[PDB]
Amino acid sequence: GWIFGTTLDSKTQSLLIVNNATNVVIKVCEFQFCNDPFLDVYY
């Protein structure tokens, strides 16, 4: 997936595209994730 935004923090809406094995979710939310993002392989 990808993240799009100006500052990618809690002060600005950011667009997130996540393509896991079943579907694609696109969320436009202002939630701040950590820099150098990661996705867990196993639960």
Partner 1 sequence: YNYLYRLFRKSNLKPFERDISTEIYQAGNKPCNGVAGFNCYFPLRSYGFR
Ligand X SMILES: *[C@@H]1O[C@H](CO)[C@@H](O)[C@H](O)[C@H]1NC(C)=O
Footprint on this chain of partner 1 (rule: CB under 8 A)? 11-13, 30
| CA distances for 11 relative to 3, 15, 29, 31, 39, angstroms | 15, 13, 10, 8, 23
Nearest approach, Cβ of 41 to partner 1 (angstroms)? 34
Residue 13 vs 19, nearer CB to partner 1? 13
Other Cβ atoms closer than 10 A to 9: 13
6 scored as a contact of ligand X (CB under 6 A)? yes
Q: 35 is in the binding site of which of partner 1, ligand X, none (Cβ under 5 to 8 A by kind)?
A: none
